[PDB]
Please model this.
Amino acid sequence: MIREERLLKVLRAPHVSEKASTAMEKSNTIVLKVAKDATKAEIKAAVQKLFEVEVEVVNTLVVKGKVKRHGQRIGRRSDWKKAYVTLKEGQNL
Amino acid sequence: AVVKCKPTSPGRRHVVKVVNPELHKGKPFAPLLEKNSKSGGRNNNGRITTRHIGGGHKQAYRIVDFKRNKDGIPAVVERLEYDPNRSANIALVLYKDGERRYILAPKGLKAGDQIQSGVDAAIKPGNTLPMRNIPVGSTVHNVEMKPGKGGQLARSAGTYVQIVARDGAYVTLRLRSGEMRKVEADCRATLGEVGNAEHMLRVLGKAGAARWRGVRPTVRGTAMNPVDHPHGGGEGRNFGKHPVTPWGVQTKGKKTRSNKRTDKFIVRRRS
Amino acid sequence: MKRTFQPSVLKRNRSHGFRARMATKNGRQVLARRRAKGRARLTVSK
RNA sequence: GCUCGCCGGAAGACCAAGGGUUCCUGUCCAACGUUAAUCGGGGCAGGGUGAGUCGACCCCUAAGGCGAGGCCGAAAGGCGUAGUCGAUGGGAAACAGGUUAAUAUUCCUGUACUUGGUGUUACUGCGAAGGGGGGACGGAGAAGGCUAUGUUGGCCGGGCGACGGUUGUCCCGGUUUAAGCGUGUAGGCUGGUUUUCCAGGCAAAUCCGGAAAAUCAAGGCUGAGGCGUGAUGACGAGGCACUACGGUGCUGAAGCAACAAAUGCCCUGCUUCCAGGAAAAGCCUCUAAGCAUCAGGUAACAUCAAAUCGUACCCCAAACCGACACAGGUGGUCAGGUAGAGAAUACCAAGGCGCUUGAGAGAACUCGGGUGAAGGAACUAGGCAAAAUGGUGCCGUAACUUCGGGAGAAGGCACGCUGAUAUGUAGGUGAGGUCCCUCGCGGAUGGAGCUGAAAUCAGUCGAAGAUACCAGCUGGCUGCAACUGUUUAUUAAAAACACAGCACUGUGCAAACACGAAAGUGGACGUAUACGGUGUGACGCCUGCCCGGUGCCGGAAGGUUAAUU
RNA sequence: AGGACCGAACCGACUAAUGUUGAAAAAUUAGCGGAUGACUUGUGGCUGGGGGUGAAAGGCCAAUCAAACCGGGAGAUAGCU
Ligand SMILES: [Mg+2]
Ligand SMILES: [Mg+2]
Ligand SMILES: [Mg+2]
Ligand SMILES: [Mg+2]
Ligand SMILES: [Mg+2]
Ligand SMILES: [Mg+2]
Ligand SMILES: [Mg+2]
Ligand SMILES: [Mg+2]
Ligand SMILES: [Mg+2]
Ligand SMILES: [Mg+2]
Ligand SMILES: [Mg+2]
Ligand SMILES: [Mg+2]
Ligand SMILES: [Mg+2]
Ligand SMILES: [Mg+2]
Ligand SMILES: [Mg+2]
Ligand SMILES: [Mg+2]
Ligand SMILES: [Mg+2]
Ligand SMILES: [Mg+2]
Ligand SMILES: [Mg+2]
Ligand SMILES: [Mg+2]
Ligand SMILES: [Mg+2]
Ligand SMILES: [Mg+2]
Ligand SMILES: [Mg+2]
Ligand SMILES: [Mg+2]
Ligand SMILES: [Mg+2]
Ligand SMILES: [Mg+2]
Ligand SMILES: [Mg+2]
Ligand SMILES: [Mg+2]
Ligand SMILES: [Mg+2]
Ligand SMILES: [Mg+2]
Ligand SMILES: [Mg+2]
Ligand SMILES: [Mg+2]
Ligand SMILES: [Mg+2]
Ligand SMILES: [Mg+2]
Ligand SMILES: [Mg+2]
Ligand SMILES: [Mg+2]
Ligand SMILES: [Mg+2]
Ligand SMILES: [Mg+2]
Ligand SMILES: [Mg+2]
Ligand SMILES: [Mg+2]
Ligand SMILES: [Mg+2]
Ligand SMILES: [Mg+2]
Ligand SMILES: [Mg+2]
Ligand SMILES: [Mg+2]
Ligand SMILES: [Mg+2]
Ligand SMILES: [Mg+2]
Ligand SMILES: [Mg+2]
Ligand SMILES: [Mg+2]
Ligand SMILES: [Mg+2]
Ligand SMILES: [Mg+2]
Ligand SMILES: [Mg+2]
Ligand SMILES: [Mg+2]
Model:
């Protein structure tokens, strides 16, 4: 079992976008920003505990931050991890 | 057999090849094979130390019994075989206890022939005996230099050694080079001549055949510049120098042997 | 026409990378020189 | 949007390398874009990369690297054993359809598959760092059996035509379906089984190897494709309806056969040749110590697990290497039609483009092309350049020659189209059906349909029938080099280098020789029919005289002569 | 069968014209040689500067080669300009 302090750290935010709303509407899939080291098992356990719904499958991907400019100064945004969490057909989060 | 090729193309006109129909046409005996990869003539510093080596056909190594110490057990030749690693052919012999080995193929040996090694082996071609059990005057090959080390002399195709005398614990041998050499009577020898004596009759016929054997072109010292070779330089063809190696040592007649450790064992240099 | 620089990240790392420099004392002196100069980029690794 | 032009073995599509947001959407036009720009690979903001099966990771090793101890070396360090790394190679498993503005073998639908852990059922000698097997391997060549794929016909849907004709032997379109699962075929390889013994396989072995008998011959292994199923499904020409006219909602026929056919598959096959063609693990199988109703193994049933990283986009290029949005360079895969030997070439399909300055004018001169009276190398250093030749079949072909050649020598004839021979021939393919069988994917026969050169005869059009593209100029004398190769990246390709062949000479193996203060290593797991050095340079006929000079080889009595004493 | 023949891909570079502040610090166009072999090409590896490598041109060793490049001795020395 994964300790609940870990679980409280792995979920960072819901992800808002047209793809995310379409995913939730058409495939019962919530899209979340998660911690970089959060595995699929941790994400699933944390959604099943913190949001107390049934998870079927977690798909994950790493988003690489963009290069941006702030007054001729080159900067880079941080990389971050996205999770496609598919709910179990009556879980409705 | 020695057959001349017909001149259907300029690279074939001079080819003379040796066809031995007796050789096994299938693959070698796998348990006795080994990998050996090529060096290009380079040593462990990565430097060329022997020029003119590189390329050539991939070759597997055949483990050959040069010791022939399985005494008192007869064996039967199953087949002659081609060995890319040496001039002589090799014979796969089956020992009556079920063990298989390769030996250098003696002249006239063929499938079905029985062989043996030991102090009580018969004096017939293919049999290995200590030379104090082989009569003086005999023709031998695969001669040992130290007892139990393994055969080291008269291994190349068509070669043999003559036992010319026996004096105490040493025998005198006439080597192929004409040298008379002493070696301890307990050193072993195989009776007969190494086979494939027609090996020296082949003609490669073209540069490519030498490239197939891993021999790279030799550039004459006189075709170089002085910076590269003592023979280098000159307007037009010029020599005017005593011929030397690329490292500047006279190469027409100067002797290079210096081994006082082994001088005793030589009776008369090949000279 | 073929030019002199033909990139390969594996060759780059094996020949100039941090661990290649750390492997010999003269490579470690390269690293010491670059740290003393204050280079923001020690090797080709980053 | 309609026309036009261009590429199409690419200028289309897709991998790997390399790049790194260039991808999609909105907004903006300062700078950047060789012009303008409302546009952009430009600015700014937001969005986008979804895996048990793809790849990495991982197991395994090659070259090579590092290397505990070790050996060696003023120091730094060199080499190297046991090991440990290292792919460009070996090792488990997924397909079809739908979907996004942008991802999909990753999402969804449907249908599969692999490995491993734990729990139950039955059976039970399991056990490795050891043994054996296997994995596991070259070049070339020939042919059969197939598939991809194409063509025609059939089927179904639509059409009846802007100007003579078009209800027919007319026209247009479609005619697609995977992995998996069952079958075990064309073909390839091999005799099988059962006992007993044995100096071999670092010990042992029921395994391997060897020997000896009995007894049986069809047993085993491998194997494309087809068939069935997967699939009552999906897809589907087209048609119906909306639009925010970009596309979506819904419905949906036929979905067959013959012929042709790969460079793909059977095939890591077969045949043959010499230059004689990785390794290790996964895997099978045998045992050691060890445990021995435990463990552990064999299959079945359930259940759990398959993490992590990559995934956008360019990729013969405006995104990679070339300072550039640069006529350059960059490995692999796909492979339609008509003609054609063809991946040449011409025109096209799918698909992609018109190359980021234009508008005029119609001088000299320059560049790239077309044609040219009469002459025809008179040009010039030189026929430089240009012009010309150019296909297939057949006829025919000299000196010389190493007997292979020279030779495509030279030179010449035929060639389109229509009809007949025969409404389509020779030939290929070969159904329905019948005869039989040791029983199927079957053997004999039969031939319908399909497909189809080539020739001859007769006629016929043009100036011209290898009509375009494409596609040898030829002969005579002579120098050099035997030949195929190599070379001055970027003014020299040659007569220069190499070469097979020849000779001399060194070298007896701890070889000579070479790299190395050394240890070592190459030479070579080679052994004088071998290896190094040197010169000469296929072959044929040959290779004369000189050892005084220099060098090398041998001698060693005599003179001279170092350190030492 | 063949370092065999003709000829694309592929590799090369014999001739000419163009280009020469180029489209290009070696190319383009038309022609040209090899094209189963001493062939060609990808990935990785090894050899290091009086050193390597060289079918040998003093060729090549990052647009640099009769002694690479970078830093140091170093403000070498310069009866010369
Ligand atoms: Mg999933
Ligand atoms: Mg993933
Ligand atoms: Mg040599
Ligand atoms: Mg020679
Ligand atoms: Mg020269
Ligand atoms: Mg010199
Ligand atoms: Mg002269
Ligand atoms: Mg002279
Ligand atoms: Mg950007
Ligand atoms: Mg865009
Ligand atoms: Mg502008
Ligand atoms: Mg932009
Ligand atoms: Mg190793
Ligand atoms: Mg080492
Ligand atoms: Mg140590
Ligand atoms: Mg490893
Ligand atoms: Mg690999
Ligand atoms: Mg896309
Ligand atoms: Mg077919
Ligand atoms: Mg993609
Ligand atoms: Mg442009
Ligand atoms: Mg370009
Ligand atoms: Mg073409
Ligand atoms: Mg004009
Ligand atoms: Mg003109
Ligand atoms: Mg003209
Ligand atoms: Mg005209
Ligand atoms: Mg004229
Ligand atoms: Mg005229
Ligand atoms: Mg005339
Ligand atoms: Mg004249
Ligand atoms: Mg004149
Ligand atoms: Mg000309
Ligand atoms: Mg012309
Ligand atoms: Mg003359
Ligand atoms: Mg020549
Ligand atoms: Mg040539
Ligand atoms: Mg040049
Ligand atoms: Mg030139
Ligand atoms: Mg040695
Ligand atoms: Mg010569
Ligand atoms: Mg000559
Ligand atoms: Mg040829
Ligand atoms: Mg070249
Ligand atoms: Mg050209
Ligand atoms: Mg030729
Ligand atoms: Mg050719
Ligand atoms: Mg010169
Ligand atoms: Mg250079
Ligand atoms: Mg110097
Ligand atoms: Mg000084
Ligand atoms: Mg100065």
